[PDB]
Design a protein around this ligand. Structure first.
Ligand SMILES: *CC(=O)[C@H](CC#C)NC(=O)CN
Ligand SMILES: *CC(=O)[C@H](CC#C)NC(=O)CN
Ligand SMILES: *CC(=O)[C@H](CC#C)NC(=O)CN
Ligand SMILES: *CC(=O)[C@H](CC#C)NC(=O)CN
Ligand SMILES: C#CC[C@H](NC(=O)CN)C(C)=O
Ligand SMILES: [K+]
Ligand SMILES: [K+]
Ligand SMILES: [K+]
Ligand SMILES: [K+]
Ligand SMILES: [K+]
Ligand SMILES: [K+]
Ligand SMILES: [K+]
Ligand SMILES: [K+]
Ligand SMILES: [K+]
Ligand SMILES: [K+]
Lengths: 347, 351, 366, 350, 347
């Protein structure tokens, strides 16, 4: 079996449960940002995923309709969706917009909401309508319909609320927190773009076309350990549809249940897996620590959003070889970058 | 050409325009009900079609979902939809729900509303969902979604309103009128059911399965003249997808300038009428109101028909349908009980 | 395990097998009608399901074509299909139309018949034909084709036949039995219609739009015990797509919270939910309505309830005669707990005289 | 009828014919780029549309495969496709890749090529393959197949060629011209983004997500006249699916609608925004505006060089009224120095 | 269990692996042709299946386009495809075109090649194009495209080559071997055609409409034993979608151990062909006769699925199974009994 020993770990919040929704991008983004609030001495927070998920879907439907169905309308998203959301829509506390509250449950189940909204967006974006209807204020009626259905299944967004003695608006609550999206950068490592440049990752959930800095694979992994050792956490978006990532919580990349010698990939081998569909933008998580196994092979400690009903109560151990091979992109505070890597990027 | 002379005509309301919506069933039903209110000395009314159209679509979506997509969800309907609707939902005046008010228009255009709601109902009724979501009051969430989208395109139903100095609810306003759906019967003439019995017409827009009394074809046409001659109007449902039905205001069934001048008409048998209904040649296309009788130069008889396509036609929205066309292409009719002849009424078991 | 002891059960016929066909509505209707003939002192009968199944599909194809595909064309049906069928088409004995006789079998297998007829009806009802062809007597040609294909797979309906020494027609044989469709009523229990009224159940196999009397749930279950205790059987249409409905011959509605409370384990095969008697979930009228509204209770299967039995622990069960053959634990007999029947029943059909007098007065039956 | 009198017009090249293909984006871009070369004193060029069209489709096929079918694979494109293409793939003259040369024709007909390549990309991008094959050098095999089919219908890209006495490569020939994509900016006018900012236009053919500067509608129209009056031409992307846009060579926005001068509908910023939101203004056609003309009644028109050949009333030249351009323009591309100095400060272009 | 004892067997080559492609028709055809060369004193050969598979698909695409999609375009084939192919395209040795050579493998995997070419052929044969493009020499452009894609996944056909000391062309290498397709006949046994006549089997992979001689079932089985006893091997095309066909290396027709087999009549064999119970599934080579422990007869069958099976890729098919599930066979003339051979008129 596996016996792990923590080398260094940073403060995180309680593990949440996305349940039946493709909202891992928002649950992991807020797990990362909540660790940022603890790190900045602002206390522990429980930010509402459903608030940003609601507003993001409204924007994605607009993107799908404007591109006549080119932008797919689905439950997925990115870390930039939350970074854009906090500046554009703001933030609200979890209690204001609770998951499943509208269908008498406590966890998310968006299968029926998707079934209706997918059909609605497709009827507009991929239909034969030649003129979309609007009211006397030039407001689109289909946007009202899509927003109304989303509110019935996710809830009504509050315009004002009281939280811990203070009355807030979604934007003033975001300013209350003091986070700012300008202080966070997205990082990747691929060869179909020049190094030390910015490009938007060609993945379906990046319909906002958020940019990422391109780093060499070895310098890319240097940011991982530097972020943990400096007191930072990592928003980790990676492929988890591999034989090495199991249910138990161990994500390894063995060289073909126990520690085995791992296969350390080249920059070209990593590129081919991204080129041949073997590495896809599947899951978003948070890396908050480093650990070792019995044989000394390294691991990153990962906080998932699948509840606490696992061997390590919702904490997974991803080997450094697995992270080097299957990572799609990461988001960390710019200050977590090493000074040399940070100068190379033109920050 | 045609030169018509009125034999008898009964009071009707102004001609309305259904426009870009399949709501002819409601506009003709309210044209019939408004003439009924005039007939009983209650005055002129302008009832809101969009109110009944809104509530009917909500029920039709429920029928489609309960039957897992068997009941088609479309814009059509029947006269019974309005008779059932006034007793269940009530009535509101036109000013409380106007057509097109929600998309900066004055007439209906339900193409975008249909495109959304059809996709919504299909995602539920014909999808792969095995358990539909509900709140803590056991209210279906999909019904809230379908109702919300309908309100965005058709308007919000009023719960109370002021009309001519008095505050009403849709239920209390219907009671003002004094009409009763029990006092109206649906009549048809086919042979795939026994005569003088009741059966629901097997047409898509009869998803409520409202029943109709079956009469022989000759006795069926007797109700037409008896209703008009005694002072009643007829809610008329007929197939208008024939070469004889023209945009010039006339609807003839000529025997072989077939549609421009009066010609000898083909008077169908009961079997010939049955075949056209069996072989798709007679379908539930259009709903109108028959309110009068007219003659041509050569003495052939016509029914004066009030359409719902506006007034931009040869006779300002009025069609002249020959009795031969009406005998052949009528799907069903709805009249007050007292418009039937006493002998025919006794055969059907009415009181 | 389960140990059942009969409290009261009424005479039934042998258990039949529908096999590979969605004809449970007819087999259960005839299990009910055969029990009615035994109760009325008419003897044992073996009514031909394939005769009624043939004629019902012809009417269902006509409904699909007339409604331009709105009425779905499938193998299902209702109890009213048999009640309407015996008055319209009549009855013939089993030996005159046996299942599988046309493809060298003894049991039904209508997969190929459905594959052809579904495509035929759809080509007419959902096609782009604007005028269907007819002969010089105004008879529809597509109806001849659909009937011809049905006869090739099900057999030719007899116009005359000899049964036990006498020559019959399907109509005259039905009159011999002395049954009358007027003596049977359909009952249901839902809230989307007023109680003590009649409405047609909004289910696909009710394309004939037969009516059912609406009763409160407690009064609805009163007809079950009163019919069995007075000597009548019940045509039972119910949902069987539940975890409690097992292939072992039991149909239960266990309360998961209580079973896990009585379990030694916390809330976080071995649960034994359906293998032994457990505390049942006694649904409310609203809980029953929600399951019908949210697709959790659907018109799946038609069976016959003919008796009442209790287990070792005294819980009540309805004895159910299925149409899946006798290769089961109780040889084709199921024990359905009253909680399951109260929760998952779509509708039932019983003789009028099986109703309590008070329930009969509230509905207006004479 | 119409009788137009020119006010000012700038040098253009001969009118070409895109024919069957939906390559208007490349033909109009090269009409614009050829006018830029004349303006900068480099002479006339006849740039190969098929060379850039070939390389653009391979990039679009890769984008469709990477996004699992989200990026649509079709014949369309944008002006940025040519600006990116000349810097990435370079430029070759028309004689090195001619239209229709591979199927014994002289004009483009890409209906069969699209039928094959659309099915190929869809089988990869939207199929059920879970691992795409590659050779020993990690080169994707499907990319070889898509490129091979494109070469069979469009021609083989030259690796070296001789033009006017000197041997060139596609990269070296582009450097000879002296063009730079940095000297060209994309401009639009919409309100769903802040003014004087950059955003990618949400149209299918902008799959590269090229940015455009957002200007108020009145300042947007100021760039049109300033560019023409100072000697520049405009790459004009606009909606042509209107009743006012006729095949006779006129494009009007009437309030005999398109046969005589009539009062025009002067759209607001909101009216222009609504048409873009409700599908009434779509990225349909790319053309080049190179001059200004008169009505009999003094109304203003932009002289437009189309890419539909010369078999029209004005031999492939359109007159677009200033009201039509104000209402139906999606975006334009001009040299930076065609912008007024004040507008350049608001956008921050140096 | 089973214990088999060989009665008589003929020389064969090693078992090969088709791996992941429907090229069993060519691998078995060349197993038959290689055994044909051994009996004729010509030595051992390894003919390239990928060469014939490449050219056969080019002809099948032309057949699909000419019949506007009626002829299906798939990976399957027949024994006549190889007999026609060797006379039309010739023969090349294996190492000049190897499976997987183009995608860094050693065995075939044509799933991606099929996904592309199927879509290409369908776009032409079943599309709405009303005039297909051609060059100046009247050569079809779509044929160039389909051929180019096939070469990218299967390899470039050699036009000249050196083998064993001499330079050959596909003409000349086929002539070197000395085989002639006229010396090979296809045989079947059905009643929907008159006996002792020729008809093309109504199966999808017989799109070339190659003919087969129709024999009564008992005389059909006489050719099996006569071929083995006289020194010939049999190209065996048969249905393998039965419960009796196991991955353990035996093919029985029971009425793991020897059991009494069911002896089908001519009508029972015909019904299975009429009601889809016997379909053209697999092509193999019969090269011998064997007994089990209990003395009932078996045919020794050489498969093309590699050698990781209980009998190292070789199956034992009972004579009752072959009598029931055989679609057609190909043998040399002289493998036929003399009495049957006059009835068919072959001289
Ligand atoms: C006349 C109309 O609008 C409507 C359209 C349909 C279907 N027709 C009917 O409802 C007739 N049943
Ligand atoms: C039980 C059965 O055979 C049939 C299957 C189908 C469809 N179900 C019904 O008829 C439901 N009453
Ligand atoms: C104008 C043209 O050919 C093309 C249409 C297609 C495909 N349009 C564009 O490329 C710009 N939208
Ligand atoms: C045996 C095989 O691979 C192939 C199936 C496919 C595809 N079968 C044939 O080629 C002849 N039936
Ligand atoms: C829908 C869906 C899958 C989904 N993936 C993403 O959102 C992309 N990171 C998820 C977190 O479950
Ligand atoms: K949270
Ligand atoms: K993967
Ligand atoms: K009205
Ligand atoms: K008609
Ligand atoms: K029976
Ligand atoms: K169920
Ligand atoms: K050019
Ligand atoms: K337009
Ligand atoms: K070989
Ligand atoms: K088989």
């Amino acid at each position: 079996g596996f016996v792990f020993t923590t080398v260094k770990e940073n403060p995180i919040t309680s593990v949440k449960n996305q349940n039946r929704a493709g909202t891992c991008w928002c649950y992991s983004s807020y797990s990362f940002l909540e660790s940022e609030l603890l790190r900045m001495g602002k206390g522990e927070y429980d930010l509402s995923e459903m608030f940003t998920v609601y507003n993001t879907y409204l924007d994605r439907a607009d993107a799908a309709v404007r591109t006549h169905g080119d932008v797919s309308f689905s439950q997925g998203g990115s870390f930039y969706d939350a970074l854009y959301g906090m500046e554009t829509f703001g933030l609200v506390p979890e209690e204001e917009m609770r998951p499943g509250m509208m269908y008498a449950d406590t966890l998310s189940n968006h299968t029926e909401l998707s079934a209706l909204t997918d059909a609605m967006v497709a009827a507009i974006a991929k239909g034969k309508l030649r003129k979309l209807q609007s009211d006397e204020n030039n407001a689109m009626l289909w946007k009202k319909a899509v927003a109304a259905v989303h509110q019935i299944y996710l809830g009504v967004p509050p315009e004002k609320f009281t939280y811990k003695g203070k009355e807030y608006t979604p934007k003033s609550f975001f300013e209350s927190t003091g986070l700012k999206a300008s202080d966070y950068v997205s990082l990747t490592s691929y060869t179909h773009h020049p190094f030390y440049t910015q490009f938007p990752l060609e993945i379906q959930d990046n319909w906002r076309h958020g940019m990422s800095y391109n780093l060499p694979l070895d310098e890319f992994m240097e940011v991982f350990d530097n972020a943990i050792n400096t007191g930072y956490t990592i928003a980790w978006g990676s492929d988890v549809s591999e034989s090495g990532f199991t249910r138990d919580g161990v994500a390894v990349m063995p060289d073909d249940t126990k520690p085995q010698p791992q296969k350390w990939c080249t920059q070209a081998e990593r590129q081919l897996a991204y080129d041949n569909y073997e590495t896809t933008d599947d899951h978003g998580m948070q890396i908050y620590g480093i650990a070792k196994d019995q044989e000394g092979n390294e691991y990153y400690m990962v906080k998932n959003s699948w509840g606490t009903n696992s061997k390590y109560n919702g904490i997974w151990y991803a080997s450094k070889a697995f992270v080097r091979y299957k990572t799609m992109n990461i988001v960390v505070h710019k200050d977590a970058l090493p000074k040399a890597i940070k100068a190379k990027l033109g920050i």
